[PDB]
């Protein structure tokens, strides 16, 4: 269709305007110090590049398993590789956790369905492989980004639903999540139409690439639709009113009330500055409002991993 | 119009010379060590990358603030962001300073009052967000080179006066400038006709996208026209007769004597060599001449910091 | 002839494709520390780049002299140089060996005689050379990965029998080895056509430049018809049912079998996962698995070279 | 002339060619540790980026002072920079000594005498400003690789003789030459007809180009003939009979012995292998070879510059 590799381009060059953003923050920025990773792994049969991910880990271990952080990426669902967010997971694993990052196979090429079956064999992956090589998958933090928080916010509902788990095509993996973090999400895409930027204005192209018409994936597109009828995690928000897609987190939490769902919020005020933008802790590991950020959000799962160790006679 | 596209299109080829010649200078020099930085944090809501600052600290702090230097790079307010002068920011630094280098948008797009309006903006920002990260604004080094040292001296006097505040549409900021250092400024660029060389041929192009047309601006153009009336911090004048602009540095300082300002000198001979050339001690933080300049300015700024808390009871 | 450049023309874009692919992997993948290299010694008198080796050394050496490794890289003997397997051969001198790395010209420039003569010489430019940088010759480990294995399994064929010395035109060199261990190798070229992929699709191209239409190459191209007849080394075949080529491995196995050729093998399982695919210990140094095959290794030559030294009345 | 600009095209294609075989080989050099530079200083007023010198030190210095060594790189007369042989000069200085390594206008721009006057500015630069940062000019080896060991041999005779400095327009420094080492000099241009390779086939034209036409230049082209009649400083060759350029240290030796020069010699036999190839010592500083080489240089100019101290009661 003209019209359709028309809006196709246009979606292909905000990225790419992104992407140059990206490369000269990263060619800056100070890298976290003391940390080893691992790049690359395949975690399926395919030479196909973003079916791979990073593992990260402090340069010295004090245990021979650290508790795991799974991290999401973001990019609206059309841009980003498993190198994407490195500094963000390096400062994590720095701390003394077990990273994993995955890629993905990004739209128009696959649909959300695609996606989500890229995370859950990435998960999959981890869960045999990951103990061998240092971790702790008793105590996980799953945490996303933007449209990695969208996903990560549907991966962990589908994880607790034999239905949805049908419907995506994927089996559950053999741990649970400790804590779903998620910073600055899209988690409600169906309302990117009702405020202002790029996506928001190609909003029923994002959405038409996400459902890849199957009407199925248009029902469950929204994490106001995979939440009903759960036991979920506890979830934690992070945002602020300079992030650009501060209405999602504000739909977000509507949703949360609504569901009875278990969360915290670190929730930067306006006049925190204007500095503290969409995803700012991930892109700027350094800066202290990110730092603090990072560590309540690790803290928070420090404290809710103890409590489970308590409560299962394991302290 | 036909002659202005062609004199923006050689004023741009002049500014690519000089950035292929920064790029290969970086690329060799020297990095100072033991130094960490912050970067590219939004000074104002706005997604333009030259809204955007550095921060610079010694990587292990003394104390919990460390004294302020503000840095205004040059390039004939047509070139340059908050990289440039990165390995200078990090020199000082070094030293136990807490440094804030800014961009601001450049010439033709914006006008000398936009370039004002950012620095202002930065300013503010530091006055909001600087403290609670290290730095000590009573103690406050203001310093630009060339284009920058113009406007760092028309900051400097902005910063005094209502009138001025209101005619380039800014506030006052809450601190104050302890020591004013500009290094190889052009001050006078009503003045750029009488020497040779590219911004002097093509001085009146750069005098007209200065003043954007605004009679006002053209009636605030100079240093000498901005202090008249006002006082003033103390000033430092680093340069030397092998600057290509030292008759500036000669212009300023008749209107420093016949405006009763205070100020110190560090002007280098021609007989101290062909290589102190404009801007040498910004561009090669490492040489031994430049180490010398460098610690002079922040020995005199210390001197007149010191002062300043013996008289405020406070040493 | 017309499909001859188009065959030539579509192999140089598969290995263009990998050559990305093993660009991406090096500008992420951590280096191993401690070890200092040599590089670019030309071993003969030629200007051809291809006709270079690297050294590598720990950068503490515990002994004047160390056992030594030499490796020969892989890439269908149309691509490579001797950086290619850098990390690897780094990896390898960290542990305490001397390592010396060749280039050697590729098709279709050269057949493999040319390819043979180039790894002899540099081989007998390290029995002048070595010796007195470090190289103890008394226990040298032959190691090759995939089209670098056939190479290597050839060699060590060669050195042993004077009439495949008159064959390839190369003289003996005056050191033996003491084990060879073969990555992945496709030593078996011939059978290329019974399984899928890029080399085996394009097989009967690879096997005419191979030969370069000598009826004595195409004699002599499959270690099974280089094998008859001699005593060799042991050998140590690594590899899995991961890799693309685990057909090759089976085939050399009953090649080993028929011939009572002494082995060890270190075969990864299915099981192991998706990621030990070909070549993985060499691609990637950092991962455990890599770790454990390439420890394996070295620690079969350490027991091998004792034995040998034990033998030889020198404990 | 048709002729003249395709021969310049050809000279330029081999340096283009040599250009990217020096950017490959320093990617992947080992880089000599514990040194500091200092870079880009003009040595006259002049913005030709040519007429810039840089200065190496050992990072932590003995002394307030070091002795001197002052490198002119090679590069065909049409070709290099003083970034050239950096890491070769960053060895050096790693020894113990203070490293000055300059610039100089390139063929066909300029001709000899231009060349040669540059070379003399940066002595005379290092006259008035080494000291203060360093260097020991009572004690001064000079050396040149190639074309310039040529320009080097050159610049220890003009050094000595009125006459000609008053033909090259050049007027003497004010410090000495302790040693003067020739690295596979070519020191004899007007023979470069009688060997083969690129620049001897393009003889004429090198010869023409470094002439610029005058007669003068043509009659004090080659060492040999300004050599006649002075007193001048011990040489040191070096190279050996893998050198390309060897039958130019042939020629060089019997033109020694002819005037009565003091010299000694390191030049490898053949025997020593081939990657001893011309200019080897410069290029890998790291090879065992090239560290005999070079500290065996180091040590002739120390055991020359220690007689000069008890001959001057001052040891
Ligand atoms: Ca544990
Ligand atoms: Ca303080
Ligand atoms: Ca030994
Ligand atoms: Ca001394
Ligand atoms: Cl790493
Ligand atoms: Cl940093
Ligand atoms: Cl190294
Ligand atoms: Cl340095």
Request: charged share 20%; proline share 4%.
């Amino acid at each position: 269709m003209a019209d359709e590799e028309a809006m196709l381009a246009k979606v292909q060059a905000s990225w790419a305007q992104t992407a140059a953003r990206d490369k000269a923050r990263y060619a800056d920025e100070r890298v976290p110090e003391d940390v080893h990773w691992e790049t690359e792994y395949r975690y399926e049969q395919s030479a196909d590049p973003q079916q791979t991910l990073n593992l990260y880990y402090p340069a010295k271990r004090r245990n021979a398993t650290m508790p795991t952080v799974i991290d999401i990426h973001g990019g609206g669902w059309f841009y980003g590789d498993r190198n994407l967010n490195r500094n963000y997971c390096r400062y994590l694993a720095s701390q003394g956790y077990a990273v994993m990052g995955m890629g993905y196979r990004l739209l128009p090429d696959v649909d959300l369905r695609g996606q989500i079956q890229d995370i859950f064999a990435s998960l999959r992956w981890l869960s045999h492989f990951g103990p061998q090589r240092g971790f702790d998958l008793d105590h996980v933090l799953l945490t996303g980004d933007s449209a990695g928080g969208h996903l990560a916010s549907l991966v962990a509902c589908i994880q607790q639903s034999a239905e949805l788990q049908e419907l995506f095509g994927v089996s559950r993996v053999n741990f649970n999540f400790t804590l779903v973090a998620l910073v600055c999400p899209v988690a409600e895409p169906s309302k990117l139409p009702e405020a202002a930027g790029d996506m928001s204005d190609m909003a029923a192209f994002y959405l038409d690439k996400l459902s890849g018409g199957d009407q199925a994936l248009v029902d469950h597109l929204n994490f106001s639709q995979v939440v009903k009828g759960l036991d979920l995690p506890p979830f934690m928000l992070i945002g602020g009113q300079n992030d650009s897609f501060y209405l999602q987190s504000q739909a977000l939490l509507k949703v949360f009330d609504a569901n009875h769902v278990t969360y915290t919020t670190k929730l930067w005020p306006a006049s925190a500055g204007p500095h503290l933008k969409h995803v700012f802790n991930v892109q700027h590991w350094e800066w202290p409002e990110s730092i603090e950020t990072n560590l309540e959000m690790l803290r928070t799962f420090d404290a809710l991993s103890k409590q489970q160790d308590q409560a299962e006679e394991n302290e």
